[PDB]
Ligand binder design. Sequence first.
Ligand SMILES: [F-]
Ligand SMILES: [F-]
Ligand SMILES: [Mn+2]
Ligand SMILES: [Mn+2]
Ligand SMILES: [Mn+2]
Ligand SMILES: [Mn+2]
Ligand SMILES: [Mn+2]
Ligand SMILES: [Mn+2]
Ligand SMILES: [Mn+2]
Ligand SMILES: [Mn+2]
Ligand code: NA
Lengths: 284, 282
Amino acid sequence: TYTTRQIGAKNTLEYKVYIEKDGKPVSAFHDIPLYADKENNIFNMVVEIPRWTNAKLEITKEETLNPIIQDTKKGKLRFVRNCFPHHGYIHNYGAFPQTWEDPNVSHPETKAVGDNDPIDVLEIGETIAYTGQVKQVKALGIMALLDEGETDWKVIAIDINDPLAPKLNDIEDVEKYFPGLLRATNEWFRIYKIPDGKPENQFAFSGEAKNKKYALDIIKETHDSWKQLIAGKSSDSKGIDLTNVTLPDTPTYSKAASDAIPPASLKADAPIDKSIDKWFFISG
Amino acid sequence: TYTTRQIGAKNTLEYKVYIEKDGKPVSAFHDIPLYADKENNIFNMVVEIPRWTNAKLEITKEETLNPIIQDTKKGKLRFVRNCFPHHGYIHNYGAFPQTWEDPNVSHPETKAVGDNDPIDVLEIGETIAYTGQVKQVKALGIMALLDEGETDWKVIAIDINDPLAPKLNDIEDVEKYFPGLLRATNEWFRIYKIPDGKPENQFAFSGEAKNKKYALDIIKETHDSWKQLIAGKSSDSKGIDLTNVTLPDTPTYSKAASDAIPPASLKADAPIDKSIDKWFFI
Ligand SMILES: [F-]
Ligand SMILES: [F-]
Ligand SMILES: [Mn+2]
Ligand SMILES: [Mn+2]
Ligand SMILES: [Mn+2]
Ligand SMILES: [Mn+2]
Ligand SMILES: [Mn+2]
Ligand SMILES: [Mn+2]
Ligand SMILES: [Mn+2]
Ligand SMILES: [Mn+2]
Ligand code: NA
């Protein structure tokens, strides 16, 4: 059973959320199995950002056990700005554990190195998720986002517990039951960093949403990249903390790491600067 | 100075927000001047619904002093559903006090009776407002919404404190600085009740957002309607509570009404049913 251990108040630099397995903290990056049900293509998604929120919370690669913390820019807590007609993130945003967008090799489909992070997941279900949540999802498709010139695939997925899950089998179904979502997703990821002073992003395949099988292929490839990483065989692991508590055959396996995590110290959410309210009317 | 007195926890049936003037509750409907600055057409807007929220909070016409209370639905609270690509309300939503969409007569421009409510205001500034807030705004334009067959004008306005207030002077400026907002506004009010089983709404003038001059004329008309109402001279006030504490020449003037209001008893927001998360694709 997966639960969360929160330290500090949300929207602060001290905030951390560790994922616990049966009460004991494990690496949100390496210890949560990619597959919930491999042959049925059911994956374990680690949720980082709830739909319609702004705080850019992320599994941190450089902290032991890889807790979820808020990303920062120029020493300040990072909040993704509101880009009309969107409010914060338009999907429950997260990642697939045990995956890695290898930054050390140019990916052929996108002709760019990976962004050094687990593969990204956009969960489209009706319910708003929570940070640290481990939910089972089925992959429906995938988009080839070039984010700031780096291969940064976005998997389209849905919580298997969603009322519409049974009717969602492949990418075409998303357009049928969530008309306009895929186009909004393409737009969102193209323009969301413009309010930060960054260029518009781009997609390969003219922004086409590749199907479920294509998605599974990329997911599996990133899983293999991670296998090499966790085995300690990457030409450059970028300082990523590979400490894990469930992979005994790995060089960085460490039982002790779990008990070294502080106990929960959850505090009420800290206030967020009113500037984050601002709705930006921008475009590519 | 205007402040708020909150009773109970937000998102519960007991929740009430009264507006206070110098610490004393006053009617949110009748006691707040329509104009903050008449000469410059700067209006006082009573905020009911903060942008991106779902709870359908409204000035209550039938309760003394007209506190803001969440609309109810079959014994429970009423929440507006999320209609893709929108999250709850897409504007700070409220009304102009001392105005009334007369339900007793058909309105020429829309050819329908009014919805019996103060005129509605959409505040487009960047800052998310708060329930019970009295903010000063500039009118930019107006949309002729026919909500479920009733005249239900929607004033487009901007908080005078907004960084863009200086550049926003007439309806055309909304498209210039907030491209797409007006089209989205038209769509929002056309479909927001569909998830509730209601028909799609319609707008007069093909949904055109009339300019400031036009808006000022309609606002003035709803204000004249209220003047008639508050004077006790409407042919039918529809059971609206006309009690006020600042209009001593009105039949329903009663300063004691302020003192009758219980003290603030603010509680933490109550959780909202997760079903309200649902995003509808209409
Ligand atoms: F990432
Ligand atoms: F109304
Ligand atoms: Mn990042
Ligand atoms: Mn990521
Ligand atoms: Mn990225
Ligand atoms: Mn990424
Ligand atoms: Mn109403
Ligand atoms: Mn109203
Ligand atoms: Mn209405
Ligand atoms: Mn109305
Ligand atoms: Na990344």
